[PDB]
C-alpha cells in the first residue's frame, strides 16, 4: 500500500494569496499563486509568499504575517489539507487566502516566530500519537537524530527520508491486532469545540476490527443519518478498517484528522 502513502503525501492544493485591501503599499501587489502541500503547515511553505508581499510595504507597516479565509483566521498549526477540506472545499478553486500583516488576531491564532516553533508543535503531535499507540515506547526509543529526520523529511518534502523513520511508528506487537489507541481528531464547522478527541481502540471485545463508521457512531453519532466525512479530500467508505486508516491515511504527525462538512449546496 506504498502507493497510497505517496498519493496522500504528495497531494497539492491550488491556492491564491491576495494581499488585504486595507494594507497600504508602495506599489501594486500581484496575487501569488502556489500549490500548497496538504500534509505541511502554512507557516512552513509560505516563505516565498512572505518575501513577495514584504517588498511592496514600508517597514513601519511590517509585522508578523498571518492568513485568513472568508474572515476566518487560518490556524497554522492545523495541516493545510485539513483547513481546506474543512473550510474551502465547497467553494471554487483556487483556495483564496488573504494575507494580513496588521491587526494580529491574538485570540484565534498562535504566534509562529520561527521554523523551530513549528517543529516544536509538530513533534508534540507525534509524541501524543505514540503515547496513544505504543505508550510512547517507539518514539522514546528513537535517537534524537531520528526525530530530526521526520521533521527534515516534512520540511524538505522527502517521502523516503520521512517514512524511513515513520514506518517504525506504524508497527505494533505481533500478539496485538493493532495499536493501543487510534490518534484522531474530528473537526466540524458548526461545533463550539475545536474538535472531538477521545479514546477509541482499533479492536472490539469480540476481536472484530472497528471501522470508520463504528468510530463515528461512537464519538460523533449526529453526523450519520446530509454530512460529508472527508479525510485528505476524499470520502472513504464507512466500512474501512480503522487500523488501516491510521497507518496509511494519517498525516505525518500520525494523527487522523477527520472533517464533517455538509453536502455542497449545488
Amino acid at each position: 500500500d506504498k502507493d497510497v502513502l505517496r498519493d496522500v503525501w504528495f497531494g497539492r492544493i491550488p491556492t491564491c494569496f491576495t494581499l488585504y485591501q486595507d494594507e497600504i503599499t508602495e506599489r501594486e501587489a500581484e496575487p501569488y499563486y502556489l500549490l500548497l502541500p496538504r500534509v505541511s503547515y502554512l507557516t512552513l511553505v509560505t516563505d516565498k509568499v512572505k518575501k513577495h508581499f514584504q517588498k511592496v510595504m514600508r517597514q513601519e507597516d511590517i509585522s508578523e504575517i498571518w492568513f485568513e479565509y472568508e474572515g476566518t483566521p487560518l490556524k497554522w498549526h492545523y495541516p493545510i489539507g485539513l483547513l481546506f477540506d474543512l473550510l474551502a472545499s465547497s467553494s471554487a478553486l483556487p483556495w483564496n487566502i488573504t494575507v494580513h500583516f496588521k491587526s494580529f488576531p491574538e485570540k484565534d491564532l498562535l504566534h509562529c516566530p520561527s521554523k523551530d516553533a513549528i517543529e516544536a508543535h509538530f513533534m508534540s503531535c507525534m509524541k501524543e500519537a505514540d503515547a496513544l499507540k505504543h505508550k510512547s515506547q517507539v518514539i522514546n526509543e528513537m535517537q534524537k537524530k531520528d526525530h530530526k529526520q521526520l521533521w527534515m523529511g516534512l520540511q524538505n518534502d522527502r517521502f523516503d527520508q520521512f517514512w524511513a523513520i515513520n514506518r517504525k511508528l506504524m508497527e505494533y506487537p505481533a500478539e496485538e491486532n493493532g495499536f493501543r489507541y487510534i490518534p484522531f481528531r474530528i473537526y466540524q464547522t458548526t461545533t463550539e469545540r475545536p474538535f472531538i478527541q477521545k479514546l477509541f481502540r482499533p479492536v472490539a471485545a469480540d476481536g472484530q476490527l472497528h471501522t470508520l463508521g463504528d468510530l463515528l457512531k461512537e464519538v460523533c453519532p449526529s453526523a450519520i443519518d446530509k454530512n460529508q466525512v472527508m479525510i485528505h479530500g476524499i470520502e472513504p467508505m464507512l466500512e474501512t478498517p480503522l487500523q488501516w486508516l491510521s497507518e496509511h491515511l494519517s498525516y505525518p504527525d500520525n494523527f487522523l484528522h477527520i472533517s464533517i462538512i455538509p453536502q455542497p449546496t449545488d
Binding site: 497531494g11 483556487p94 479530500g233 476524499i234 472513504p236
Partner: protein, 40 residues
C-alpha cells in the same frame, strides 16, 4: 485481489489529484515564470 474499500480509496485519491492538483499544476508554473520576469 485488493478489497473494495481499498480500491475505492485509490480511485478517489487519483480523482482528487485530477480535479485539484493536475488541473493547476502547469498554469501555476507558467504564471510564476511570468511573475518573476515582471519583477526584473
Amino acid at each position: 485481489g485488493r478489497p473494495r474499500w481499498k480500491r475505492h480509496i485509490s480511485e478517489q485519491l487519483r480523482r482528487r489529484d485530477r480535479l485539484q492538483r493536475q488541473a493547476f499544476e502547469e498554469i501555476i508554473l507558467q504564471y510564476n515564470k511570468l511573475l518573476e520576469k515582471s519583477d526584473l
